[model samples]
Target: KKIESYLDKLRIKEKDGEERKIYAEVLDGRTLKTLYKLSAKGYITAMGGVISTGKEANVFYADGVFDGKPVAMAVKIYRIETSEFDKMDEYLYGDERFDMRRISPKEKVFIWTEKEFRNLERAKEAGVSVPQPYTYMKNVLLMEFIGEDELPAPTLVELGRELKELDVEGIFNDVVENVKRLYQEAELVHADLSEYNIMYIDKVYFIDMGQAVTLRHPMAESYLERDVRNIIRFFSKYGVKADFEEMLKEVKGE
Candidate 1:
């Protein structure tokens, strides 16, 4: 009953059908409770529209209060029911930071949420441009919104033809620098880095750190190599041909 009332307050009308079903799947009983806790703590004042939606999670634009000042925020809600649990298991398995030997799917999702929260914190502390994570509860992550006037920034791939007019080489260089800092300073590898995960306003900002792993993880080296290759492959189309070996050496600070 309380959850229904809260959902009504958020204007999630029953008439929305498909959209409401998506919300129903994501905002299960426990997830709704966690969101209530966050609201009671004054971290989020109002919920807004969906910013991004994916297989495992959904990002929402929201109004929040930080240190008594109102600010725009992004609320990332990981779908526990529909998340690819087996894929998540693969990432969690070799990670030494957590013991996932005997855990349920829901618990794995919770840990995955925490992993992303910590990864973003590490990346931000290393001076990499990422959404500044405020806090996380269970499968919910609240972070700084990277946009202007409630409009979310566009990903590199979303920018499409307009990218031709911008400083493609400079943006590539900036991305490489960010990758280097994330590796050397944060000691982490974004397991999946590509044009899709990068947001651009004036410069590039890396998002979607949920799968990022520490350098100590067994597949870190391969993931790092793959990340560099992906970036090089994308930029090559824009007249930025970079030698893989040279870029790898630079990223490793060699």
Candidate 2:
């Protein structure tokens, strides 16, 4: 009843063809139940608009009470049926924390959602700038909103052009340090770091960490090197450059 009225108030197109609702494309019955569970437990009090949508998941903005204070939250929901989960197998199968044996595709996505939640937590604990994850269950994850009020933060792609008035070298150094903390303290490689996935608001914050792998993953070293090179590549256009070898050495604490 609450959800129905909330959706009605949002005036989301009730019937977007066969999808039924805006989020209906990804919100499975089980996932809906999970949202209700979170609301029941006071983790989320209301749902808002879509923040972003991608092949793997869609992030939604919401109003929630955390620690008894009203806070803006980002709710990430991983699609069970539509996601490129087959590719995810390579990322999750070797992780020590997960039991890879006989894991179903649907279950893999759930684990993937939880993995991102935990990844953000690890990054936060390591003093790395990331969305501070509040909690997660099944396919839904709630975390600190990266932007003001109802707005989401701009990615480096937009900021690189709009904030041309900003210092490229300073931003470049900040990203390198973040990458170092993520590797040295969190013991993980983002694997997919690039300007597009970084959020900028005074400083850079890395997002989209579902594909991040720990040091134990076979491709960790290669991924870390790739992450380093990516930062160098993005900043190079701004006249900031770093020697790959020395940058990698510093990132690895050598």
Candidate 3:
């Protein structure tokens, strides 16, 4: 009843059929309780509208007091009831940091959330342009919101369309540098790097690091190569030239 009331207050209408269904499916009992707990602890003051809904999770705008002031946060909550654990397991299995011996499905979801939180922290520590992580509890992750005044930032693909005659050369160079830092400094591979996951606010900021793996992962090397190829392919359209082999060498500091 309280959940329904909160949704109603947010102007989420049952009339919006499909969208409401998605919301209803995601905001299950446990998720609502988790949000309430976070609010009680003062991690999140209030929930705003949904910023995005992905295959495994949803991102919401939230108001909060972090770092001693009111700030906007991106709250990501992974749906335990709906998440495809098989794929998440594959990513989690090879990481030495996580022991996937015999944990329940719910525990796995919580670990995945913590993995992403740690991954963001590692990236920020390495001076990579990523959303600064604030804190995470169970399946909920609260991080620095990428945009200002409640408006979300545009992804690279979205920004590309509007940026006519942009500094293609410089943009591509910065991306390569960021990739190198992610490899050398962070010692992690963004298994799914591409224009789609890169956000462009002031410059490019990498988002969606849930699948990122440390250098020790068995598939880490293969994933690194794939990331280089994806970035090259995206920038090639804008006349940005890059040799995949050279890029790899540069990233590995070879």
Candidate 4:
């Protein structure tokens, strides 16, 4: 009954039928309870509209309070029943941080949520620009919103031709630096880094670290190579020329 009330609050706040259906599809009983607990703990005041949607999770803009000040937050909820559990298992299996065995699908989702929170924390500590993760529970992750007034920063792909006016080369350099920091300082490889995953306002902010893995993972080097290649491939369109071998060495600090 209490959970239904919370769902009603969210449903009332989100009047759009599409968004309401998204919530209904993703918010299972446990997810609703977890969201309620997060709100009751004062991390989130009210839920807002959808920021972005992914295959496994949906990020929603939310109103929150931190240190007695109003703040905007992104609430990422991983869909338990509909998540790509096999893909998640592939990323989690070789990472020493998580012990993956015959755990239930729900358990895997919880760990995946926590893994993203930790990855963001590590990236921030390494001086890489990413959404600052505040807290996570079960399938929900609360973090800093990387936009203004509920408008999200556009991805590099989203910006498209606007890259011509911006300092495209400079942005490329920043992204390379961040990749270096992630590898050398954070000891993690963002397996899915690309134009679509990078958000740019004044600068680039890497998003979607749920599939990131530690350096010790068997596929880390390959993932890093792919990440660097994606960056180079994207920047090449903007007249940025970079030697792939040299860039790989630079990122590896070799």
Candidate 5:
């Protein structure tokens, strides 16, 4: 059932290894094939963006017309190098699944960058409401753009509001379950999941996956503890009555 949930979450397509070179700059050919395949399938038309300005990845808005419906997508271009790169070390540095010291500063971040895509894959597979991963190139990730005409979707980090009079308890409960599913089902944890990375459209969807990791982290249990705490703290300010320690124990199957 857990694996099934993750499979359902991955509603997006698998890479078919087809390439359509669309630009003058030479791209990693294999990844170009994935992009080409997505374009051929009409997931995107043209993509435009950069490190979403001071963000972990350079995010771009991909534009496309599918079945006459115009939509925009967010494409994240992550810096793969280790040197000259700063920020987000608390999440990435101690991860044993990743070799932190071998790569140049330019190459180290790719591990987290790629984890974002894999985590997206896990979330999507688990039937989690997340952006669909369309394709990837080097450290660049392409996913469903969240607005009309490829207009950028607003981040919860930027939202100054939320449900005014709805069942805040229900909403908070659902979010807690979502986090549990992420941990118990996908065997992954969004080490940095928070309001800033969550988006509420038809439903609450998580955006940033750059800091997510599998059960492989030495601190998986500890990470889950802090993650549950963070979620509880954030919703508590809105009057949600979720308890922090109880959540960690419950999600950990303790």
Candidate 6:
């Protein structure tokens, strides 16, 4: 009943504000039940932050606390309104590794959530520096806090102006090494690696990874090559002369 009233109020607010809401169904009975269960168990209290609306999912910084420590984790909520289901017929049709059969309309928003968490797990296992995933529920994955004083670390593309004395060369080199490590150790391709997805923490913590596909995926080779190109082009703007194709061949041990 409480959630229902909240929904009604949101209906009023929507009429006035005309803003696209980040949460599609905060009042979904099932969702409220899940949130209550989680809160009762002391996992997270409340989450609130700016939204990074992307083509795939919207990342929201939510309040997090576990074992009595303050934390904040981004919640990448998949868009239900988007034609994600229809496109799955195209992208994931013959992919055996991704078990799309388990997905349904009701369970749709969680697909990207699962993919990104799985990618994060793969990255961590491959020794790629990334945010440590804490837990994942349907449509929600909680991760290690990315900032020092409550700010998510700035992405590489957004870094230099703040920390002027930073070693751009060393940072770029570490990125290249991680590329080699991601390919050879992880056997996965980021597919859309660029400065945008990388956060400059104590080091780089690659985030927003729902598009990562395993080495067995049909287009993994080309995906890996393109990822290298994206990285090389990005740092080249900073005077780092890394060649994308050369890096790709080296990664393939050619």
Q: What TM-score does candidate 2 get on C-alpha atoms?
A: 0.88
Residue 173 of candidate 4: its Cα lDDT? 89
For candidate 4, what is the TM-score? 0.92
Tell me which of candidates 3 and 5 scores higher on lDDT: 3
lDDT string, candidate 6, 1-254, tens digits: 34432332221122322232434433354444444555556666565554477655566565667567867766555554546345433344334656766667666657666767777887789898877776777766677767765577889888854434577777877777777777888766776888888888767777765667677777778778778878777777777777666777777777
Q: For residues 9-123, what per-residue lDDT tens digits would candidate 5 score against the true structure?
A: 1122321232112221223444345556666776667655322544444565667554567666686755443445454555664556566666665555555566677778888
lDDT of 3: 0.81
Q: What shift in Å separates residue 141 of candidate 4 from its native position after superposition?
A: 0.3
Ten residues in sequence with the least summed lDDT for candidate 3 = 5-14
CA lDDT, every model vs. true structure? 0.83, 0.81, 0.81, 0.85, 0.62, 0.65
| Candidate 6 TM-score to native | 0.79
Q: What tens digits encode model 1's per-residue C-alpha lDDT throughout 116-200?
A: 9988998999998999988899889999999898899998888766788888888899999999999999988988899999999
lDDT of 4 by residue, 71-120 (tens): 88999998777444467767775777777565666588888898999999
- Give residue 144's error in model 2 in angstroms: 0.7
The reply for model 2, stretches above 4 Å from the true place, is 1-20, 82-85
RMSD of 4: 2.5
lDDT of candidate 6 at residue 93, scale 0 to 100: 34
For model 2, residues 1-254, the per-residue Cα lDDT tens digits are 34642332222222354434566656767777788778878888777778898887888888888888888899998876745446666777467878857576657788888889989998999989998888999888899999897889999887775645788788888898999999999988887899889998889889777879989888888988888888888888777867999889888888
Candidate 4: Cα lDDT at 139: 90
TM-score per model over all chains: 0.89, 0.88, 0.88, 0.92, 0.69, 0.79
lDDT of 2: 0.81
RMSD of each: 2.9, 3.8, 3.3, 2.5, 11.0, 4.6
Stretch of 10 with least lDDT, candidate 2 = 5-14
Which parts of model 4 have CA positions greater than 4 angstroms off? 1-6, 11-19, 82-85, 101-105
Clashing pairs in 3: none
Off by over 4 Å in 6: 1-33, 66-70, 82-97, 160-164
